[PDB]
Symmetry: C3
Subunit: 236 residues, 3 copies
């Protein structure tokens, strides 16, 4: 996260860190708890992942230093990628992880609500991006989960900033005209969380951008409300 600050332990209790054990164990990408056997994340995270067996999901984590050989985790029973995904920039960047066991909900780990089809015209004013990603384009994975408040921008606006891409209605964009705050490498698959009517909604999945936090380059996120049918179908 560029231009963010350290989170308070458990203020983002749906946020997970997904690790790979190959070749030695490391953070791979963010994700969100949406059901007690279910993590919502980005399809692109699974490039060159041949098996769910090398994946570990850690919940209730603030600092990456909490994770050691003796730390408990959830195994992944199945990776489910949207059947129309090709790459982050052309959309459908969405995947589900079916956990081998179920998450016991608690103050340190609990699900985030999905937005509802009838909220397509809601104006979110309290949206945050979170993760353990780089603090600039050339950096390293951060120990402490970072947060940053970022305003939504309309698709018409986002499209003007990405003339060489098609910004579709299945994407949503967030950023400062002058940049300075954004996701970056290591944040993808994580949530864009917006509080509305005292409740937090999973509005976006962190997906792609041109560099990190650059002026006139909003972050691009998978527009979660567009996939609620798909989520329902697959989580059966």
């Amino acid at each position: 996260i560029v231009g963010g600050t350290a989170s308070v332990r458990g203020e983002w209790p749906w946020q997970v860190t997904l690790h790979t054990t190959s070749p030695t164990q490391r953070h791979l990408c963010g994700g969100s708890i949406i059901g007690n056997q279910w993590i919502l994340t980005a399809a692109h995270c699974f490039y060159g992942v041949e098996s769910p067996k090398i994946l570990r999901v850690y919940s209730g984590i603030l600092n990456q230093a909490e994770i050691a050989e003796d730390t408990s985790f959830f195994g992944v029973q199945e990776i489910i990628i949207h059947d129309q995904y090709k790459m982050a920039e052309s959309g459908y960047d969405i995947a589900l992880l079916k956990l081998e066991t179920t998450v016991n909900y608690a103050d340190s780990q609990r699900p985030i609500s999905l937005p509802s089809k009838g909220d397509r015209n809601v104006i979110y004013t309290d949206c945050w991006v979170t993760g353990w990603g780089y603090r600039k384009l050339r950096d390293k994975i951060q120990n402490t989960l970072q947060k940053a408040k970022i305003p939504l921008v309309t698709n018409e606006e986002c499209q003007k900033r990405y003339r060489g891409h098609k910004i579709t209605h299945k994407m949503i964009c967030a950023g400062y005209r002058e940049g300075g705050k954004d996701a970056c490498k290591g944040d993808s698959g994580g949530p864009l969380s917006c509080k509305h009517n005292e409740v937090w909604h999973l509005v976006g999945i962190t997906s792609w951008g041109e560099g990190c936090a650059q002026r006139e380059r909003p972050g691009v996120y998978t527009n979660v409300v567009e996939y609620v049918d798909w989520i329902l179908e697959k989580t059966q």
Copy 2:
């Protein structure tokens, strides 16, 4: 209907009683007129129904005692069940009956309007459940069509009351925290009718609940607005 009252003749002119003639003729479930050859009802009503030939649809009925051997009815040309239905509790509990002849609309029999996709955020405050079902869990089919006003509850609220089920965005729930008014056995397939802007909309199809009218157990209804594409496709 638990805790309801007798309806006035024709105040629910889209409400039908669907009968089976096997082994002797009896009420099977409720339904709603949505087009002049078309009844909207619940898929689960057709468990063990091998043929449309044993089905009779009665319209303009207030009292089950109006129905006798010489009473006219509409035969069913075809039963159409949603192809993803398995059982009431996992959703898609929706079916269409194509009538052999067309209904002549009149004050005693006429169609109810379907809700529109752009009403997903409407707040219905005037909703009623109707049918000839039991007045409690252990009872019998009632002679006179009963009605009851029941408030909608949000899906988040409904979900808390049904911890062992998945209450999906394709369901909608209605009930009193303290219970006392609800559908019951014999009511299913019938409408949940809500009046908005001087017009009645078919918001729900009566589907399932844990017992009838129990405290903290709202009734669960198929969320009709979610199926308008499906209704359009099939009624061609």
Copy 3:
């Protein structure tokens, strides 16, 4: 267009005239620029069109007399018709033309924005129908692009006027109770353009009606917001 007036050059810069070169060149129908290789139009326009090779798309046109042998045009690489279209009156009257080259946007030719799924409850009050069609049922193609302001009517209202048709939620209707202003022969495939919040949206595609501009016979238009998924899918 019945009861309309001459347009100002370039006030409808997304409007195109689609011509056929067989047997001698003539106007065939209207269309709208929605992307720089993409025209949105009506499926029915392509009845008996065996090949894209005989199609020419002209942009930046006010008067049909601008079109001559030496006038530049865009060839069509591909005709894409909705796979569920059978005929205008049963709906799905929508088609895309993939142009052989890309349109250079300018003040005389530029794309119109598609409505968004979250605008299904917007109340459009500033809607216009445009084209080079007949000024009455028995007439000829007009030289100068005509315009007419026409109010939207609800589907319930439209349905009452077309008792022998099914007016679906994928259609939208516009007209005066007393008639007098409407599309007519030669206008189809063209836009119904509504200005909302200082922006123009492509709300309808001119599709069908009973005669032209008759009292109690609104024009019927393909309801574009219902096809945004389809447009996205096909324009890949």
